[PDB]
Structure 1
Amino acid sequence: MKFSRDVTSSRRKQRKAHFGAPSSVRRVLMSAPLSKELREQYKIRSLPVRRDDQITVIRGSNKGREGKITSVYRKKFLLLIERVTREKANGASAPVGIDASKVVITKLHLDKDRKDLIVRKGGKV
């Protein structure tokens, strides 16, 4: 139970906040879990997604597929992963977006900006 008067448990205000989130806040709502071998040797449970990270789709009609993210399409809360696509009628290939909570991360894109965060969130590297 939220014992605080600081946070709102209104449904109305929680949906407005989710759908009025700026990119610098949508970037957190687009987190993904870490796979088991990543999770245990970094001691961290999840991470916000980043381009070039290697993920495998857990849930959906594209279950079990892997690939590299091309662009975290933040406006519509979607992830476009390479070599997963849907075929249009005319013959073009328009990739469909998977949600950041339906995919797990098996390989990271380590950078000095990310390395500080990992040890920041109680981790080890």
Structure 2
Amino acid sequence: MKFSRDVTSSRRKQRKAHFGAPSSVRRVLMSAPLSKELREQYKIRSLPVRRDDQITVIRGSNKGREGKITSVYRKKFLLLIERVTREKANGASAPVGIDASKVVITKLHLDKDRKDLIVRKGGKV
């Protein structure tokens, strides 16, 4: 259980602060688990999701399709991966929203910011 009088357990307060969080909170709520090969070389359980990562999809109907993230859609809480596209009737293709909690990260888009987050948060390069 929780033993703090400054955290909330009501579904009302928790389910409002989720669906109406700003687009900076909506970033760390869209995080992905790292692969078992990266979990031991960065010593990080999970990273927040950037654009242009290198992921694989574990759950859902699009199982196992690998790609890179095209447009991290922070509003409707879903990633958008390359070439995983449900068709449309007209002839154009539509993007399929894969949840950011389903994908497994296989290669980070390492930058100066991420490294300065990696090297302090329990790991190294």
Partner of 2:69: 69
Structure 2 gap segments, 5+ residues each: none
How far residue 78 of structure 1 moved from its aligned partner, in angstroms, is: 0.8
Normalising by structure 2, report the TM-score: 0.98
How far residue 74 of structure 1 moved from its aligned partner, in angstroms, is: 0.5
C-alpha separation between the residues in 2 aligned to 1:122 and 1:57? 26
C-alpha separation between the residues in 1 aligned to 2:56 and 2:104? 6
C-alpha separation between the residues in 2 aligned to 1:81 and 1:48? 16
C-alpha separation between the residues in 2 aligned to 1:73 and 1:97? 9
C-alpha separation between the residues in 2 aligned to 1:64 and 1:113? 29
How far residue 121 of structure 1 moved from its aligned partner, in angstroms, is: 1.1
Structure 1 gap segments, 5+ residues each: none
How far residue 24 of structure 1 moved from its aligned partner, in angstroms, is: 0.6
C-alpha separation between the residues in 1 aligned to 2:92 and 2:122? 45
C-alpha separation between the residues in 2 aligned to 1:16 and 1:80? 25
Match of 1:86, SS state, is strand
How far residue 122 of structure 1 moved from its aligned partner, in angstroms, is: 1.2
How far residue 46 of structure 1 moved from its aligned partner, in angstroms, is: 0.3
How far residue 89 of structure 1 moved from its aligned partner, in angstroms, is: 0.6
Aligned residues: 125
Q: Which has the larger share of helix? A: 1
How far residue 120 of structure 1 moved from its aligned partner, in angstroms, is: 2.0
Match of 1:39, SS state, is coil
